[PDB]
Structure formats: structure tokens, C-alpha cells
């Protein structure tokens, strides 16, 4: 989904 | 196992074979880290929408203190120049904000910049959504002036996709249709840990090889927690060249016969670089 670290 | 030997020059004689038509490459900071674009590897907000939101300004100063000197792409993009004018390039799908791809003369058809570009600017308002160019956008940053929307006096923010922000549509139609049909993957400058855009390594059919160029190994499973296999003994398809992109690219291109074709680029295309 989002952008994740 | 299509790889004769699980070596560069496995994957050389590899994409000399008839069978290599389309390669997709994966690409992170560490291609640009010798264009001068820093590798960034409470203080990890800096790019996290929800402070973004709260407070642009810290972004916008450390954007001004971070913007590069000069554009000039690396050999490793140049190696992807030659992919493209070859035929062999299905995509290349980008980690980086950079625009040094489409220096390097990618197009946006070759191009899905998986977390945004500070190529294109917009205005955040949704009934306006002005568009500026990086040249607008730079003078904003380096006059220490939060960029504002002249027609409307919103925020314009950088088309980058900010942690927390879901990823381009594009990212996604993109990767449903190109590895489908990827004979070859290269993963170049990047560690893997950003989602979900390292997930697109597990993307690709399961016979098609995987030539990653890094400082370190990426990729493999965590023993905790599709993954790499360097060095089992089922290892079969994954290559690790390890050291620096430029390097990497650069004995690639050798084994290829591009070395001169590649130097040759380079040299010119800085050439003109220097001389703008
Ligand atoms: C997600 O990984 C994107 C992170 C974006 C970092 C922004 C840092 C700002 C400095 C970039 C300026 C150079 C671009 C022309
Ligand atoms: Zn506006």
C-alpha cells in the first residue's frame, strides 16, 4: 500500500 | 535454471542469448550516490506526510541544503541509456526523486518513478493543482521562500511520494503487466527496504534471473520474518555483484562488448553536461 520503511 | 554459471559473466553471455528480450531494472540511491545525491543511510518525520502537513518548512531547508550542484547522471544510468537504444529495456522502476534517469535520455514510458520526482511540482489545492517546473521550484527553495501557488496561494509540493503516501497509480498498472513477460532483472543501488516497492523483485516468474549490483547483499529472507538466493546449494538464478554501481555496470558493459560504447556515451553526454 503506502510507502513503507 | 537459465544462467550457465551463477557469475557476471553467466548473466553477460546470458543477455547475449536469443532468450533475453526484456529487462527491467530496479534501481535505488546508490545509482546516484556518484552524481552526488546523498543516500539517507523525531528525525525520520522529515519525510513522513503527517509532518509534511503539520510543517513543510524543515523539508523545504533541507531540500535547499541537499540540492546538488549539477544534474550529471552516473555510468550506471548511461549503462540503462544503452539498454534502452539496444531494445532491451522493458522498464526501469526507480526508487529515486532525482530525475537523472530522464537525463540519461529515459523517456516516461521507460520510467515509473515508484516515489514521485522533483521534476514536476504542484499546487496542493485540489481545485487548482497548478503545475511548476523544477526550475520554479529550485528558486523557491534557495530564496529560503515556502514555495506558494500564484494562483491560488496554496502550498505547491514536489511531485515526490512522501512515507505514508501510497504509491503512484502507474507503479501498480505498471508492475501488473511488465513481469508477466521480464526475462532479466537488475537491481542496481538498492537495498530492498523500502515497501512496497521491494516486493517487486518476488514479481518476476520464478525462472527469470536476477543480477543484483550493490555495496552488500539485499534481498534474501529474513530468518525471522520470493527472496534472493545468492548461496544455497538451491541457489539457481540470483546473482550478487558486490561494490559500487559505476564499477558493477562498467564490467557488465566490458563483458557485453559496450565498454567503448558506454565510455563513449559518458564522455560526450558530460561533455555537453559541463558545457550548458
Ligand atoms: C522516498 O523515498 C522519497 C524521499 C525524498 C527525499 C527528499 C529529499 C530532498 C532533496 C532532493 C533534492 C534533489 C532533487 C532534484
Ligand atoms: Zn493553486
Not at chain 1, 1 to 5: D, E, I, S, Y
Not at chain 2, 260 to 265: G, H, N, P, S, T
Request: proline letters at 5%; a negative charge; charged letters at 25%.
Amino acid at each position: 500500500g503506502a510507502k513503507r520503511h | 535454471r537459465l544462467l550457465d554459471e551463477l557469475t557476471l559473466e553467466g548473466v553477460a553471455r546470458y543477455m547475449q542469448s536469443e532468450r533475453c528480450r526484456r529487462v527491467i531494472c530496479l534501481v535505488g540511491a546508490g545509482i546516484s550516490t556518484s552524481a552526488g545525491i546523498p543516500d539517507f543511510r523525531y528525525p525520520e518525520a522529515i519525510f513522513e506526510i503527517s509532518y509534511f502537513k503539520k510543517h513543510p518548512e524543515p523539508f523545504f531547508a533541507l531540500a535547499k541544503e541537499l540540492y546538488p550542484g549539477q544534474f550529471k547522471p552516473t555510468i550506471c544510468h548511461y549503462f540503462m541509456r544503452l539498454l534502452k537504444d539496444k531494445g532491451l529495456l522493458l522498464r526501469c522502476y526507480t526508487q529515486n526523486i532525482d530525475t537523472l534517469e530522464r537525463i540519461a535520455g529515459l523517456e516516461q514510458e521507460d520510467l515509473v518513478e515508484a516515489h514521485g520526482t522533483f521534476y514536476t511540482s504542484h499546487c496542493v489545492s485540489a481545485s487548482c493543482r497548478h503545475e511548476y517546473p523544477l526550475s520554479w521550484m529550485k528558486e523557491k527553495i534557495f530564496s529560503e521562500v515556502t514555495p506558494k501557488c500564484e494562483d491560488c496561494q496554496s502550498l505547491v509540493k514536489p511531485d515526490i511520494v512522501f512515507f505514508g503516501e501510497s504509491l503512484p497509480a502507474r507503479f501498480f498498472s505498471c508492475m501488473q503487466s511488465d513481469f508477466l513477460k521480464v526475462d532479466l532483472l537488475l537491481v542496481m543501488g538498492t537495498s530492498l527496504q523500502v515497501q512496497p516497492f521491494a516486493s517487486l523483485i518476488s514479481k518476476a516468474p520464478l525462472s527469470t534471473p536476477r543480477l543484483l549490483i550493490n555495496k552488500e547483499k539485499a534481498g534474501q529472507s529474513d530468518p525471522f520474518l520470493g527472496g534472493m538466493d545468492f548461496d544455497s546449494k538451491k541457489a539457481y538464478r540470483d546473482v550478487a555483484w558486490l561494490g559500487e554501481c559505476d564499477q558493477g555496470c562498467l564490467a557488465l558493459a566490458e563483458l557485453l562488448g559496450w565498454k567503448k560504447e558506454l565510455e563513449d556515451l559518458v564522455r560526450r553526454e558530460h561533455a555537453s553536461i559541463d558545457a550548458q
